[PDB]
Each structure stands twice: as C-alpha cells, then as structure tokens.
UniProtKB/TrEMBL annotation, chain B:
Name this polypeptide is given: Hepatitis B virus receptor binding protein
Compartments where found: Cell membrane
Keyword RNA-binding carried by entry: no
Lineage: Eukaryota, Metazoa, Chordata, Craniata, Vertebrata
Keyword Disulfide bond part of the UniProt annotation: yes
SS bonds (residue pairs): 25-85, 129-187
Entry keyword set: Adaptive immunity, Cell membrane, Disulfide bond, Glycoprotein, Immunity, Immunoglobulin, Immunoglobulin domain, Membrane, Receptor
Signal peptide start and end residues: none
Domain Ig-like intervals: 2-99, 108-204
One GO biological process term: adaptive immune response
GO CC term, one of those recorded: immunoglobulin complex
Length: 207, 205
C-alpha cells in the first residue's frame, strides 16, 4: 500500500545551534478512501508526543501524502540517538516502522584546500574556482561559497564520494567572471562539518 | 510478476572500436516452478537474432537472474539508435527501451589542478582533474603516470551544472615524494564530443 520514507535533518540545521533541525517522516501513496493515518515517534525507544503534522496534499494521482515533522535537539542528533517513525494506516495490515540516525562511526575532521583556476581557462569569460574537502566522516556536511560577507552566485557542490581510507571527499565549483578574478577580489570556501572546530571552517582563495 | 531491467553499454566501450559495447537485458524475479523465458531483441523496430544468453535456468533465493546480452555497433549507439528488449506465466510480454542520452553534445574541457601549498604538510598529497561542460553524462576519466595506469584515484559522479552542462572532478592520491621529484601525471578523459573520443592533460611540479 502506502510507502514510508524518513529524511534526516539538514547538516546546517544540526551544526548551528541558532538554526532548527528536524527529522521528517513522509508517507505517500496513502489511499484516497483511507485518509486517517497514525504516527508514533520514538527517541531511543522512548515515545515522544511533541511532533507536528504538516498539512496534507492532494495530487493528480489522488493518492494523498501525509508528512509529520519532529524537531530535535542538536546534541541528541550529534550524540547519534536513534529516531523511529511508526506509520499506521487502515489499508495496511502491519504498521510500517522506519528508523533513521546519524551515521555510526568514528568522525573525522575534513581538510579543506582552495584551488585557483588554470591558465588554459583564463582565455574564457567565466573561470572556475575549486574547493577540495577531504577526509571527513560521516557524509553529512555542508559547503558554501561567499565573497565580502555576502553569498556568492553560481556554485555547485558534488555529492560525497567514498575514498580509499574509508572516508568521504567532495569538490565544490564556483563560477566567476575572469574580471572578478583579475580585479583582485577575494572569495571564500565555507565548510561546515561536525568534526570541525565550532562546526565551521573557512579558506580564502584569491589571485 | 517478473521484472525486466535493461542497461546501456559502458561509456568506454563505445568510444573505442577496439573494445566491444554490450546492451544488457537482465530479467529478475523470474519465479520458481517456472524458469522459462523467451527474448526478442529489436533495433529501431527491426529485430536482430544475435544475442547471447549467459546465466541460464533459475536456481536462486527466489530466483537466479536470466540475462541476455546484445553486441552492438559503436556508431550505431553513437547515432542514437533505440534498442528494445522484449521479454516473454505472464499475460503480456515486458518491453523495455534504451538509447544514447538525447541532446546536444558538448566538447569537454580538462583542467589539471596541483595540490594546495597547505597540503604539503602531509606526505600523501592529491592531484585534481576538472572536466567541465560535457554532454551527455556518459564519460570516462582515468589517471596515468609514465604509461603505467596507477589507480589510487577516486572519481566523483557527473553533476548537472547551471548552464545545462555536466561536470566532474577527479582526485588522484599520490605520495608527496613523487610530486617533490617533479614527476608527470596525466589525466585521461574519454567523451564522444572530444577529438578522437580522447584527450590527455599532463600535470607536474
Ligand atoms: C503518485 O505521485 C506521488 C507524488 O509524486 C508527484 O506527483 C505525481 C503525480 C508526479 O507528478 C510526480 O512527478 C510528482 O513528484 C509519487 O510520490 C513519490 O513516491 C516515490 C516512491 O514511489 C518517492 O521516491 C522516493 O524519493 C526519495 C527522495 O525524495 C526526495 O527527493 C525528491 C526529488 O528527488 C522529492 O520530490 C521528494 O519530495 C523528496 O524531497 C526531499 O524532501 C525532504 C523532506 O521534505 C527534504 O528534507 C529533502 O531535502 C528533499 N530532497 C530533495 C533532493 O529535494 C528517495 O530517498 C526514495 O529512495 C529510497 O527508497 C527507494 C525505494 O522506494 C530506494 O530505491 C532508494 O534507494 C531509497 O532507499 C533509501 O536509501 C537510503 C540511503 O541509501 C536508506 O537509508 C534507506 O533506508 C532507503 N529506504 C528504504 C528503507 O527503502 C524514493 O525514491 C518520491 O519521493 C515521491 N515524491 C514526492 C514528491 O513525495 C508516487 O510514487 C505516485 N504513486 C504512484 C502509484 O504512481
């Protein structure tokens, strides 16, 4: 019948105390003639009742989609506490139990190296800046680009890749005009990982 | 009941006439107490006989997958021909279709990047290869040093870039010593839009 998916909190939400993290239980393909679902959240076995059910959606399919959100404590997720979502539906015989938690294992603090473009690239109106982030565990991490305080435009970050030493790495590419590189402006790679100091580090790249 | 999954040839196979590209019609969940199955391969609607079965009759946990392999022409795959597998305890035969990713091909650019001066500290540094603005995602990237292909490199998946193009990076991990000597390390990239479907970019201290 209906399928159930559990989505962990965004890394940036857990690494900054100022921000609000939350585990998300999304159950889809719930039948049109069975609107009533029943969530049961469990933090390390202990059932909690501070969750909140977002408003539901009707699709072209006509199969309704119900989402329940539980706000968590940053340290509780950082401590690797298990979160278990139990979805109960009138169509299914047995409720669907799902479980999500922080990736288990000895954490490693990422090293971050900024790499300038190549001469061969210079010929072009738009050159690329590279940020190498390697040797981090787990895969949870958030990387951004900025210049002179405000966020930078046109960057993409590649997914985490499993490396030889059992750790992850990634590369982030920021596309800027040849001018802004030759004009002497200074850009910055902001890396946010839990094993870092204050869950934050920053490397400045410039001509 | 039974599921039919079809997979394209490896990108490296089609970019070299020397190698042999194959289209793979993997049938899973065959069932048990019935292991029978029939295959009908089609190229642009026109059926072709020359497909070889490999695994043979099911024996497994519920099933052992029964698979059919087609050998195809390099340029025929490069000229966007559509390949269709027709698998026939089933009311209607399952038909799957696959072909080269449609779109406009773009000539990749390759830029090799030395390690940071921050990285020297470690006796195991990293070399980088940036492949930018290619399409489709079907691409090959390998690392080389003086003819001999040493592999201590990891390659990130192709990522959809803003301008609709694909890109990726590649990281070769070597001892600092080799970089200190002044050795040369080449990035090999293979893409259909490229010249001779191949390009090389050397990097050295
Ligand atoms: C009827 O329609 C609905 C709704 O679809 C919408 O309407 C229809 C009419 C069309 O117009 C659609 O185009 C339109 O979108 C269909 O609903 C879909 O159902 C499928 C399953 O059949 C779901 O697939 C799952 O997707 C998740 C990833 O989902 C995120 O990303 C999507 C884009 O990529 C996005 O659309 C989703 O909303 C969702 O977005 C995330 O949202 C969270 C929470 O809000 C947010 O915080 C995130 O940032 C955001 N992410 C992004 C990228 O935007 C995927 O994870 C699922 O994969 C798991 O399950 C598979 C088996 O089902 C398995 O093969 C996968 O490998 C994977 O398995 C998991 O893997 C992890 C790690 O390896 C592991 O830890 C887990 O244990 C394992 N899971 C288990 C236990 O199995 C899966 O692919 C769609 O999300 C869902 N769409 C939406 C929009 O909700 C419906 O199918 C239609 N029904 C019929 C009968 O046709």
């Amino acid at each position: 019948g209906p399928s159930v998916f559990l989505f962990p909190p965004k890394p940036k939400d857990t690494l900054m105390i100022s921000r609000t993290p939350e585990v998300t239980c999304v159950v889809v393909d719930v039948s049109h003639e069975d609107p009533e679902v029943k969530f049961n959240w469990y933090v390390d076995g202990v059932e909690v009742h501070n969750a909140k059910t977002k408003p539901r959606e009707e699709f072209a399919n006509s199969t309704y989609r119900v989402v329940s959100v539980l706000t968590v404590l940053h340290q509780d997720w950082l401590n690797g506490k298990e979160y278990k979502c139990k979805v109960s539906n009138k169509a299914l015989p047995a409720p669907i139990e799902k479980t999500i938690s922080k990736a288990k294992g000895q954490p490693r603090e990422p090293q971050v190296y900024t790499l300038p473009p190549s001469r061969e690239e210079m010929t072009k109106n738009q050159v690329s800046l590279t940020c190498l982030v390697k040797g981090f565990y787990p895969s949870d991490i958030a990387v951004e680009w900025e210049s002179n305080g405000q966020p930078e435009n046109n960057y993409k970050t590649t997914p985490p890749v499993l490396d030889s030493d059992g750790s992850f790495f990634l590369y982030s590419k920021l596309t800027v005009d040849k001018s802004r590189w030759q004009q002497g402006n200074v850009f910055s790679c902001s890396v946010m990982h839990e094993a870092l100091h204050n869950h934050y580090t920053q490397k400045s790249l410039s001509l």
